[PDB]
Design a protein around this nucleic acid. Sequence first.
RNA 1: UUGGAGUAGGCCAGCUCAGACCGAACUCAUUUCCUGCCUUUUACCGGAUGUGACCGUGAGUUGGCCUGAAAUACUCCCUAAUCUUUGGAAACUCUCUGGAUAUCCCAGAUU
Lengths: 90, 94, 240, 268, 103, 241, 310, 321, 96
Amino acid sequence: MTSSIGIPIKLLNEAQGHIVTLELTTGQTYRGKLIEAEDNMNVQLKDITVTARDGRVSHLEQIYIRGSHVRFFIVPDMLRNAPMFRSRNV
Amino acid sequence: VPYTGENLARPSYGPANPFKNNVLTGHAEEMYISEATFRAKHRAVEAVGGGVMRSNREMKEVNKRLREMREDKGSATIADGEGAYIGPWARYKR
Amino acid sequence: DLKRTLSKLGIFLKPSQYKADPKVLMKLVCEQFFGPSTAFVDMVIKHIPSPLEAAEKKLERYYTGPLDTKIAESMKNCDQNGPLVVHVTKLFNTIDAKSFYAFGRVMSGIARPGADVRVLGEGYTLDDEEDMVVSRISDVFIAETRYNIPTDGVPAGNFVLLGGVDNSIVKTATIVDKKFDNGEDAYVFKPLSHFTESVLKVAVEPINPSELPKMLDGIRKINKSYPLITTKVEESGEHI
Amino acid sequence: PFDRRSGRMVRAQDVPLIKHWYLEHCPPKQPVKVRVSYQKLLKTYVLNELHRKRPKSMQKQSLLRTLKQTKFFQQTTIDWVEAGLQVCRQGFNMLNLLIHRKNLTYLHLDYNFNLKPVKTLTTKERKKSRFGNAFHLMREILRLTKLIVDAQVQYRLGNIDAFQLADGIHYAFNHVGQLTGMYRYKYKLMHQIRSCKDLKHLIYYRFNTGPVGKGPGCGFWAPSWRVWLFFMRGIIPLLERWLGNLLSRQFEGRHSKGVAKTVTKQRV
Amino acid sequence: YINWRMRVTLNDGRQMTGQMLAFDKHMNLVLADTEEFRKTKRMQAKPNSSTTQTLIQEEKRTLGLTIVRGANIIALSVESPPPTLTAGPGVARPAGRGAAAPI
Amino acid sequence: PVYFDRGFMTDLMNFPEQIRNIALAGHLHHGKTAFMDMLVLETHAIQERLDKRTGKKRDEQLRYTDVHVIERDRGLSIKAAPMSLVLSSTKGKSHLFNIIDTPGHVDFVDEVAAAFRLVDGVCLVVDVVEGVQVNTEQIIKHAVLEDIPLTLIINKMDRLILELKIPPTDAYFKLKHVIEEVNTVIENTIPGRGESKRLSPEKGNVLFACTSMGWCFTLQSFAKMYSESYGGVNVEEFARR
Amino acid sequence: TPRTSNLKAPLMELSGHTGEIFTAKFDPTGTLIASGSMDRTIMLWRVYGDCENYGVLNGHKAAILDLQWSRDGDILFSASADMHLASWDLTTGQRIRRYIGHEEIINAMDVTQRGEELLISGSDDGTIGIWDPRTKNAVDYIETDFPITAVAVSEAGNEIYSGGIDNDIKVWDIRKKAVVHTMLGHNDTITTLRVSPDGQQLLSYAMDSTARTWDIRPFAPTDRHIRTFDGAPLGLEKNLIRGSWSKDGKKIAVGAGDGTVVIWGSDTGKLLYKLPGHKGTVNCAEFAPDGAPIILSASSDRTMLLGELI
Amino acid sequence: EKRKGGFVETQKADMPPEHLRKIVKDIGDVSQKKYTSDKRSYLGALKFMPHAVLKLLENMPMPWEAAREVKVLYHVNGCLTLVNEIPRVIEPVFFAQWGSMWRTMRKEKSDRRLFKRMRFPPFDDEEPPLSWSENIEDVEPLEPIQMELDEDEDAAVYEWFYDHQPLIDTPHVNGPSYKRWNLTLPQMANLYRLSEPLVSDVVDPNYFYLFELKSFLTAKALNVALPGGPRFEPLYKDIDPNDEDFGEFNAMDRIIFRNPIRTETRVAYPYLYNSRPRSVHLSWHSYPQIVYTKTEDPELPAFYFDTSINPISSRAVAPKN
Amino acid sequence: PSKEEVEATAERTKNALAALVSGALAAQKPKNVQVNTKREATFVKYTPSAQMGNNTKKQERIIKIVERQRDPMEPPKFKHKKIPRGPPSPPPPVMH
RNA sequence: UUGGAGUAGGCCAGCUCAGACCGAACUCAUUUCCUGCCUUUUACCGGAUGUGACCGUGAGUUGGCCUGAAAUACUCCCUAAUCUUUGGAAACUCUCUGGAUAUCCCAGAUU
Ligand SMILES: Nc1nc2c(ncn2[C@@H]2O[C@H](COP(=O)(O)OP(=O)(O)OP(=O)(O)O)[C@@H](O)[C@H]2O)c(=O)[nH]1
Ligand SMILES: [Mg+2]
């Protein structure tokens, strides 16, 4: 069998380069520019605004986030209007 | 308005003339019956034995008596000589 | 046998396509093998700069104005919220060839329809402002050669096709906003530096001397449409 | 089409076999008649492409399919030689029936479609029997058809072999102007005759090189046969109209005046 | 079931609401025009009543498009359904009705 | 009809970092309009109309960006021709490409100059058979003197396989000869720093293509094919080797 | 002679079928018309505006013997002598599906409009098919032993009035699949069966040229027959003539083989109209459902007449 | 459904050929008084005789066929027999068949001692027409012109090459209506080789530079003749230099004269080299040069470094810096 | 007259003249083969009048009329004739 | 992985469209002009200009014919080794913060 990739995973791949806001299993919300996302949803970010559930607001650069420990992501409406949502019949 | 039941019910007054066909021999009107209707009524008049309470089994015996009134069709595996096929060109013996 | 080989590779076609002509079959098998132009897209993304990266180079290479200004900063950062600057260098004539859509690059701002602009010629300076015409951008297209997509606005770092700013442009123009909000002046981009010479010389006159003004208008349109063409009137009254 | 592996089937007359011979440059060292032939064939090709049309044959009914819809026409499969014998017999009987209805039985139509008087004609008879262009063009076309069908009949009887058959067909389609008077009733048929002569020059010169001598034996008849099929294509609407009007006069009479005469030069 | 409106309940007890777009074999949920619900049971102790009414405040916030991690979805509730005539041969004309039609 | 969304294209216009402005430039008839045809047929739904063509016009090349009547009659480009396409990378991310297709005749280098003024990078299309020709040299000189970044597209690999009919080792040598000829013109224009602007397939700025058959690859993308087939290869190291 | 409708003319003629028009029905809003005819087609018209044939539905292999609309006018159902029913989406003009299972000509069909939608069909194999308009397979079928030519659904939605060769209007209960009771009195085969808009009475027209109104409310005497309207002779074609009630229910119309649509008063019994206009038998006569005085008559003339009752 | 017009409808069938044969034999020459009621139609069908001539002559057999059967549409009088066929052919197969005829005919003309041309007309003027049934019907036909094909070399077309409609029962055609074909590579190669006397050698489209339709039309509009091309009546007989007398441009003292511009250049660049270029056509400028050469040695593989190809040297590549 | 009366007149006259134009066209171009595929039947209702000599009523008659299949090869049957034109319509009073 | 909707091939006939390439092919007529040849016409020369016809073609659609096949099948729509569904769980104390505030309780966070 030939391995296909999931639509949310390739949506992360199309979301690379934009200002994504995600949050993680310790209840932590991170904002910034995504620079690489892989099929196991491991991501990096570069201009991170940090809001941790203990009330910790901070800002730093170049973080690595595990896809097992992430909870969800937020991406813009143009990435809603991306071409892969047009189901090309083959 | 001219086709109201009252207007159609009222008749023309006056005594009759003491003294309207478009054909010289009658009245002809263009009509739109069905082809099956015409063919069935024409058949009812045209076939012999019109009406007649008569079932499919006795259809089969009437056809049997007619089919041995007809002559012998032949075998259709003998090309020449006696016994050859004549089929639908068999004479009704009279 | 072909079905066997391509099924080994994982390439599948309809059997009619299998019995198709060799050239169409070859194109179909190449589509199933190589796929689309993702290799070209990767190469260009990796080895060619963004407008956000090449704006500074193109400013220091082709801007006559001072580089330490806020309009220079807006063009350097490709800000779509800044003043409108479009560097028009090509003119594509319309379908009936009655006018010349001005094709250029939006450097800063957003080029949007019904917008009052100043079209600046190749010889516009602060003291000598004869090569400046106030006009209005009337139509804005994304050009697709075979067709045009009319839009409500083309942002910075992009290519725009402008209708309405046509007449004053001869070879190259800089279309700037009417008045910048910082109280700062406008400067033009440098002319094109072509890399061959127009050395072949042809004289024209009309067959109808009454129709000679039509030759003048057509020669103007020719001079607009062809960048390296140069038209003169030699003093014997002969058009060159 | 040899770069293809699939296609649609085309008409046998729509395959030109030597069109690229005259479409490419002429080979070196050719006679002047051959060079002129190459140029005339190019001229016909360029004029065809220049006057290329684009009609709308939509209201088109097929004649043979309408006739097939009727009860008076039936369908069967026969040999081509049988069909040709029938067509030649039918054409002969038609022209003979027309002659006899017009009471011109002092004219004899023979089986090769020659029309001759059987005696010396008076002036009155010569006038009543001066046939016209529609009759005579149809008679010469049936004469050519007879010549072709008769060549096939000779081959099928066994009097000639197949090489002689092909050579005779090629001779006939190249010598229409000598074997008929079809040009005498339609003078643009000289365009068709000239086309066949140009093809004869090209084919002959490329065919009789080296060990192949000069004389009869060339049976490469498809180009000339093509030419006469396309001539027929153009001549059908014209002759079917003309023959229909011949039959209108024969069967309901001539309307003499009534449609007004124009003011010609002699009437000004 | 694609392009219906969905409410998804997540393992700590959250709710993510709105229009869903796609899925995968891992049932990762992408969903658009989202607003989020937190069921925070707040102890709004009134100064006049001694009964501490633990009111489940369902606070909401709009975010946009979600990409929910597939190892986190608990519950999915469906809410609402998603949001060539060639002209014929016929002519129509005024006409009369007839002469008399006697009974 | 297109296979993307034009509103999405306008939003890609709004974000100015994922945009590339490129010009396709090269010698006469080396395949620039044909490369644009490849991209147009990937993005646009016009294959059914091209299939409904019959005869010699069914054999005709599309040439989407040639629209002038001189272009359709003479068969060469004389005007520059811009298009804006939403193309996809190997990772699947849509980008915006503003591409200007330039002429290749040595007379319309004014069109080439105007396009080079507008664009940020130049993809140079070079026929693998003829190699570096006169307008290839002219365009190389102008591009590197204006300091425009340069990538290379070696075209007509079907002419390698089907016309010349040379074995694959000699095909490698032919490709190496063409790439080194391009780099030789680079070096002879800027001595001492052509190595800083070196074009070679192992770096990934050389693309092998056949535009009549609609395919292209880099070594990195071909190693990515090997990665997707056999699983678990290190793609950059494989392409380098 | 006043103007009593928003038509282009007090009477208009719609032509374009190339065969006998066997059925013609109004929209539930009374602005569209679907006509099914023996050229195996359905033609879709707009009555207002001016008039426009806006649709043609093809796909049936034989004559369109009956049709009906949905509750809101987006799905059209039709029974045809190809032994099939069919449902058609009218926004795309395309056949949703076919309902298969009848073994002879499907003479009549009706659609249950209230509660939840159903299809009822009466056919010459002696069957009454109960069809759900989502499955091609029949939910149920009542099995008689005589051909059935007219069917109607009670407003309650679970009784079916069916008449056929046996000259008796048999009222059946669906859930029992069994005959409740037989209204008797007709002498020839019932051609139409229609309930009044208020729902307490049943018009039936048979081939003995008598249009009888019957009672439907459960409290009624042993003889349930209200009245026997006359004035519409069956001609020489044994067609299934389809009458109707007025929207207010005071008028009652059938077609008649002398080309005449005949209208009586359902309460009184007097012949209100005997409108002419057709040269074949008038197979269908339909009052407008929006309360307008518009009458529609469809005949075996390959045309129909749409007039106003001034 | 079987009576959707009032009656049971069936397809029109073919009759026996003996039926048509009996009809024409009975009517003969239309001489017996029985056939007067046919005489008006017979003579009336004369109007349609041109179609019958075209249909027969286009469905005529090819030199490799001894006999051909054709469908005919005949009148029940015996007045008009119309060949109801179109001679539809696979164009590669038809090329190969006539190329094989070219070669076979040339061999026979070199090998025959004396070629006796057959007489025209083949029959006498007063000789009555022959009969199918008594002169042709069952007569043994002679051998048609056919190439001796090769059981091994021409194996790919061996069984079917000279059939009337080749491959009509095989999956290489759409069906008996003979409208679409598909052939294999061995079959196509064998047909190309058999059609070798009549195939164009031209591979480069640059061969027809200034010798193609647009150039011919431009030369016609310019009233000039290309070398080897056709010549026409002028498009514009209006311009003479004496009419274009000494106004401004015709000054021989003003024009610099180099070596002269030719007619081919005037046609190749019609808007630069002509003052009034009306109705001229812009021809295709160039094509990329074809570097394909046909291999003569048949033992050579598909991919090989040909001797005609200039060699690639390591120091010809030479990465310098 | 008003626009509605002018358009009613134009429709009536366009119909009559169009029928004559079709007649003239079919006369000017005979339609190659003079058979029709659309050879459907007309039905006529036929109520008869009495008889020559009988006044007894007799049965109503349905007539199926079809156009006859004529042989497409046939020329027209009858030779045309020259007849002098008939007298005019009765001349009107001379109102001088 | 499925339910929903589908049913073959060949051939014949009709209808509707299609050229900018219906047609990798090629004829005829004719309008208005120009040239030529010509005692008048027809039959002609060869250029322009439009306008018809004829020999053909494709796609869609509808009906029929021929040979099969027959709950078979195909056709579409749609679908336990770490890194994710084969787990560090489950339970609840202690401490801290907030509400209540004398506590109980509860929330958040931590071990
Ligand atoms: N063998 C081969 N020929 C090709 C290929 N691509 C294009 N061609 C041919 O090359 C010729 C010229 O290509 P064009 O499409 O005109 O490309 P171009 O470089 O834009 O030409 P110009 O605009 O004049 O510079 C065309 O006739 C194509 O058929 C290819 O990939 N392989
Ligand atoms: Mg190009």
